[PDB]
Amino acid sequence: VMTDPIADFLTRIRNANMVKHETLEVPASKIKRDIAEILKREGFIRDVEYIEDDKQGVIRVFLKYGKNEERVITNLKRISKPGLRAYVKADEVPKVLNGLGIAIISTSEGVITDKEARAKNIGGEVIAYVW
């Protein structure tokens, strides 16, 4: 059974990106929408749209590829896992490739990138790394 829909979402993106698939689809959840929009506004993914269905909804991700079909997303990594949760204090927020990547972090203020988290000086659960 699926024990980590978030990790499943990241791996779906990773697999689709590896094959350079133009788009992908996932069952919709609030955390997944947050991750998708963060990637959108960070320019990793081309676009995001939402389909309303009767089960839980669907989120469709249009991947972004650069000139020469170069992959924008080098890789994604799930940091906090159900097996072992990962929490970082405000001063512990990490840097992904010295900022060239990002870390998606869930805080009391919402799901935000590591830049924003250390701007507000708040910690949280390190959901993922992206670069």
Applying CB under 7 A, among 62, 74, 81, 89 the residue interacting with RNA is 81
Check residue 3 for interaction with RNA (CB under 7 A).
yes
Instruction: Single out the segment in contact with RNA by CB under 7 A; choices: 44-52, 80-88, 90-98, 119-127.
Output: 80-88
| Under 8 Å between Cβ of 12 and 26 | yes
Instruction: Please report how close the Cβ of residue 61 comes to RNA at its closest, in angstroms.
Output: 12
Applying CB under 7 A, among 7, 39, 93, 112 the residue interacting with RNA is 7
State how far the Cα of 4 lies from the Cα of 79, in Å rounded to an integer.
12
Greatest C-alpha distance within the chain? 42
Subset of residues 34 to 63 that bind RNA, contact rule: CB under 7 A: 54-56
Check residue 15 for interaction with RNA (CB under 7 A).
yes
Check residue 108 for interaction with RNA (CB under 7 A).
no
Write the CA distances from 10 to 7, 16, 65, 92, integer angstroms.
5, 10, 17, 23
Write the CA distances from 56 to 2, 33, 75, integer angstroms.
15, 12, 27
Applying CB under 7 A, among 35, 45, 73, 78 the residue interacting with RNA is 78
Check residue 23 for interaction with RNA (CB under 7 A).
no
Burial class (CB in 10 A: 0-12, 13-18, 19+), 44: buried
Instruction: Please report how close the Cβ of residue 119 comes to RNA at its closest, in angstroms.
Output: 26
Query: Which amino acid type is present at position 70?
Result: E
Residues that bind RNA (CB under 7 A): 1-4, 7-8, 10-12, 14-16, 18-19, 21, 24, 27, 54-56, 75, 78, 81-84
